[PDB]
Symmetry: D2
Subunit: 213 residues, 4 copies
């Protein structure tokens, strides 16, 4: 009952980790808004969540698109009211390329899906979030060490996401907490995320919580 | 004598720190190429100070967020002096202090492009022209580690990105090239200035740092107000 | 119910944080063993409060820098409750604020022994008695990252040592045992959580939801002593 | 000329990195005190190379875990050369690889005393005899950051402590005295980094860890 009568937006909830987060919050009593760009994973989950007695909404959204992010956030707020949690799962390697292979468009595609998207969701969600609310971002070991062969653009965006998370923490607290998970199965990851989004972590903000999974 | 017959490209001498680095390297015997954008009065000072040492800098106007102007500057440098031994990327800056509510998406990209994307373009363009054992020095910030001060969220984020980019690029382009970052703090309205940051940059570009790569070197003080 | 029939050893309940952890694990169904040293008036509160839950803590006197008292405390716990599922090591502290010129070698060792050597001893001793999937939680500190405040150099140093010990030990004892650290700040005397909240982070790290966390340092703002 | 008429103590200077440090410093004009606790060959070799350069050096046998020997070594430095400008604490070591079940309390103490207690002793002792503008340089390690490889638990722990100690001391003794770590390509390369941190080139660098692949 950690998320009783609470509304959680999981941004990028279509597969794997985001999907597992969506369900875990429902298992703990939350209304859950799922976003996706890519629909089966999300629909399923919506059904799983309804089967639990709980409420959910699935919304198509390209998270690099300021307008579709506004539309998604607004639907969530209009349906359930105050947002208690934003979990921003979207991101990805895209592909492996050395710098000689990357063109400017590819660089921006990676930075946009991992980093710009988070700027958009956090920016849009914040004015709607409940006092005591919380944001959880996803960083990566690649952000700390520079990443493996061909993953330069993705590593860079994750390091950015780590710095952004600490900076936003200071900017929006005490009202709103902001923490990163640095990723064991999808549901293990979701246990950690649910901890960070819960009042169990009322005094945790600006931090990176690592998990083998 | 540290840089006698070495070609050093200082990208971002539109900033005071590039003025300081450009003069430092020339004082140490380097062939200096410096790019500039904006009013670039700091660049004009570097050029006139460099002439006073009896050599001459190749100074080139280039908005380093523009891939074409980045390629021109790199080509002209290669044309004039041959192999690039050092690229020092100092472009970037705070642009303005704004909370996330005050920032719009075009403000976000302006900060990230000037601080981070410019770094991608210039390293990407310079790399094929660089000498064996050449060094890149990037500009990070203690803000990159801790999230920065009030209103500096976009800037801090780009300074964290540069730190990670530096570690990745280092693994990718070594052993031929080294890549490292300076991590200054800020000047409050024992702190060193751009003249002292320039000293650490010169160190990282020198033969004494031949085996330093993928590192962020801290220094107290800095290039802008906190 | 998170710790129902779990055996949790809180080593260092001579300190307020050990009072807070012991009561918290007891609230969540654990069999609690707590060791104590000094006036231990905090350990005495934990024991009385635990009794009021209708169970009974095993409280054991032990100076955790003394290998023999560590072995006894550990045996006594294994003898009473069987396999140890959780070792929470909270012994340590500042002792006194002294500059390097004011410290003597014996002072240096006193701080390092109570904070670090005690951890080596209790982890070394407990390991063979621990269950598969058991968790160790160690006590680091933000001062371990940044070098600490005025006069706290011996303490801070021991807290960075604890952080590195936590990472090496995790690589050595996994996958059977997890090892992690909490990393609090400090209470200013001028949103800071207290020992009750740090205890909540410890409980998490000892729990089933943290099965795939190991080798990590988990920060929390606020803490167990005055800055 | 970076160390012209400056006195540097290199604690642990009989082999590899300390020996290279002691030499490098001489090459830039320093008076150099070398401590060693091993066979005295490497440290006398070095003393000889240094006099070849026309500079003064002094080797001293010292167990740096021994408070009395450290006091006598510092004291002899002072008598001979005057104010100390730089302490470079190179002493440290794995000693051996043992899992925690294999370590006894005496082994644990031995590793922490060689890597960590020695540094407490040498910094504590030198400090009151250091010149304004002086500098300490310690040796951390990637093991301090990541916990070390198999059997190296005690060594890694001592290294993490050395890193924290470096940052804490830097705040305690500045601005008068700077304190930094090298996190270690050959011994001469390492020595060039050390020399930089010990020099006025690093006047604004304190409380830091500088990495080198070496």
């Amino acid at each position: 009952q950690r998320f009783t009568n609470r509304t959680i937006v999981v941004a990028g909830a279509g597969r794997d980790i985001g999907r597992a987060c969506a369900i875990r919050f429902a298992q703990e009593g939350a209304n859950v808004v799922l976003t996706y760009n890519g629909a089966e994973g999300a629909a399923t989950a919506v059904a799983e969540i309804e089967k639990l007695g709980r409420s959910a909404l699935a919304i198509k959204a390209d998270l690099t698109n300021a307008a579709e992010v506004e539309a998604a956030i607004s639907a969530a707020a209009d349906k359930f009211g105050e947002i208690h949690g934003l979990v921003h799962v979207a991101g990805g390697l895209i592909a492996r390329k050395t710098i000689a292979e990357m063109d400017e468009a590819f660089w921006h595609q990676v930075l946009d899906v991992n980093l710009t998207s988070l700027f958009l969701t956090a920016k849009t969600a914040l004015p709607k979030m409940a006092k005591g609310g919380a944001i959880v971002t996803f960083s990566s070991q690649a952000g700390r060490d520079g990443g493996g062969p061909g993953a330069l653009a993705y590593a860079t965006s994750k390091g950015a996401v780590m710095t952004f998370t600490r900076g936003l923490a200071k900017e929006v607290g005490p009202k709103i907490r902001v923490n990163a998970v640095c990723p064991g199965s999808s549901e293990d990851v979701a246990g950690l995320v649910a901890f960070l989004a819960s009042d169990d972590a009322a005094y945790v903000t600006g931090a990176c919580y690592d998990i083998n999974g």
